[PDB]
Amino acid sequence: MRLWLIRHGETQANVDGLYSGHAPTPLTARGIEQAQNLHTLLDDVSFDLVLCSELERAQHTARLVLSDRQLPVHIIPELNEMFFGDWEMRHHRDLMQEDAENYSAWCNDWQHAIPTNGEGFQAFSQRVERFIARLSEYQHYQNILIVSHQGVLSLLIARLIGMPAESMWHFRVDQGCWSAIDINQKFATLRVLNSRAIGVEN
């Protein structure tokens, strides 16, 4: 099978440098342009399954990429952005002053520190691990499109090719781009990362 990875387009929180999390921040006109361009970039890619995160910025993207195509869309909560709790829709500068200790512990130990009343990277990375273990349930599909977020998709790449969760940061997943990873007998091959070219089915 091949997973076509798409991160949602630009959002207002991105423009304002804010932590996004589960908060419903809207797509910016640039993010609509990014998704609309992606629709034509992968128009001739014959998908048979779409898996999308619950957050509407991802579903808004999946609508624009899909357009009139009418493909089945599964809403997978495992594909959701990390839940930052009290820190959502707030900026890094303000957090170091309003919540100094809990936020410093996160900046100095992002892998184990829990965002204030949110979910830590351990629970987040276990969610993605469960999604990976669920891929056998889609074994009858050939071209699955995944619409998700930067942290989910980057960690998905890292875990699929057999690396620890920490090395997710070697694969930044960009907006307005698409990536693809092939899996055969649970051996993952990263084939395309952050392309803006017309897709070609493999």
Is 98 known to be catalytic? Answer: no
- In angstroms, how far is the first alpha carbon of the chain from the final one? 10
CB 158 within 8 A of CB 185: no
- The alpha-helical segments, DSSP class H, found in the chain are 12-15, 29-41, 56-66, 92-98, 100-108, 121-133, 150-160
Give residues with Cβ within 8 angstroms of 133, minimum separation 6. none
- Residue type for 39, please? H
Euclidean distance between CA atoms 60 and 85, whole angstroms:
23
Q: Is the dihedral of CA 176, 42, 4, 20 positive or negative?
A: positive
CB 79 within 8 A of CB 71: no
Domain boundaries, the chain: 2-202
CATH architecture of 2-202: 3-Layer(aba) Sandwich (3.40)
Euclidean distance between CA atoms 114 and 72, whole angstroms:
35
Resolution in A, one decimal?
2.5
Euclidean distance between CA atoms 93 and 197, whole angstroms:
37
CB 201 within 8 A of CB 35: no
Closest-CA residue to 175 (of 201, 154, 144): 154
Phi, psi values for residue 107, rounded to 5° = -65, -30
- Paired with 178 in beta bridges are 195
Residue 65, both tokens? 């990429």
Give residues with Cβ within 8 angstroms of 34, minimum separation 6. 9, 10, 175, 176
Euclidean distance between CA atoms 167 and 101, whole angstroms:
26
Euclidean distance between CA atoms 201 and 14, whole angstroms:
31
Q: β-pairing, 178-184 with 143-148? A: unpaired
Euclidean distance between CA atoms 35 and 6, whole angstroms:
9
H/E stretch holding 179 reads strand 178-184
Name the residue with tokens 């055969």.
Answer: 184
Experimental method: X-ray
List Cα–Cα distances, 62 to 19, 51, 108, 156, 159, in angstroms: 22, 9, 35, 18, 24
Catalytic residue among 10, 78, 81, 119: 81
Give residues with Cβ within 8 angstroms of 156, minimum separation 6. 3, 5, 128, 131, 132, 146, 148, 181
Is 129 known to be catalytic? Answer: no
Euclidean distance between CA atoms 38 and 53, whole angstroms:
18
Euclidean distance between CA atoms 16 and 77, whole angstroms:
26
- Residue type for 101, please? E
